[PDB]
C-alpha cells in the first residue's frame, strides 16, 4: 500500500473554520464554559470570513 | 392494474345488490312496537 497518494481524497482535510463566536457559542450552549462578558459584543459584531476573501487573490503575469 | 378491484367485482356487487333523484330517502328505521319509531333519512329539512 501507500500513504499520501489519495489526491482529491484523504490527502486534504475539508474541515470548517470555527471562529471565536462559533466556538464560544458552542461551549456556552453545551455548558462547558460560563458565558464570558465579551461574548455579547463579539456576537453582535461577528468576525468576517477571511478565507473567502483570501480565495480572491489572483496571480498576475508581470 | 393490481390497484383497482375490477369490472368483475363491480358486476358481482351489483348482482348481490350491495351497490346497485338527489336524496336517497329513508335509509334506516328502528320500530319499537308499542313505543314508536326512529327513522334515519337522507333529505333536506328546509328546501325539502
Amino acid at each position: 500500500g501507500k500513504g499520501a497518494v489519495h489526491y482529491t481524497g484523504t490527502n486534504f482535510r475539508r474541515v470548517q473554520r470555527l471562529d471565536i463566536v462559533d466556538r464560544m457559542r458552542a461551549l456556552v450552549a453545551q455548558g462547558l464554559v460560563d458565558a464570558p462578558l465579551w461574548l455579547s459584543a463579539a456576537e453582535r459584531a461577528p468576525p468576517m470570513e477571511l478565507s473567502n476573501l483570501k480565495l480572491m487573490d489572483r496571480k498576475v503575469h508581470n | 392494474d393490481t390497484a383497482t378491484a375490477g369490472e368483475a367485482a363491480r358486476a358481482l356487487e351489483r348482482e348481490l345488490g350491495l351497490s346497485r333523484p338527489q336524496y336517497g330517502g329513508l335509509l334506516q328505521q328502528i320500530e319499537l312496537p308499542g313505543f314508536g319509531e326512529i327513522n334515519v333519512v337522507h333529505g333536506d329539512l328546509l328546501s325539502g
Binding site: - | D1, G6, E7, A8
Partner: protein, 50 residues
C-alpha cells in the same frame, strides 16, 4: 371474463395510443434539431471549401 377483457382491452388501447404519440413527438423533435444542425454545418463547410 368478458367484462374484465373489455376493461383490459380499453386500458391496453389507451396505453398504446399514449406511447405511440409521445414517441412520435420525441422523434420529431430530435429530427428537427439534427436537421437544423446539419443545415448550418453544410453551409459552413461549403464556405470553407470556397
Amino acid at each position: 371474463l368478458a367484462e374484465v377483457t373489455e376493461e383490459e382491452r380499453q386500458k391496453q388501447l389507451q396505453l398504446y395510443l399514449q406511447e405511440k404519440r409521445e414517441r412520435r413527438l420525441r422523434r420529431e423533435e430530435q429530427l428537427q434539431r439534427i436537421y437544423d444542425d446539419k443545415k448550418r454545418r453544410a453551409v459552413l463547410k461549403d464556405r470553407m471549401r470556397i
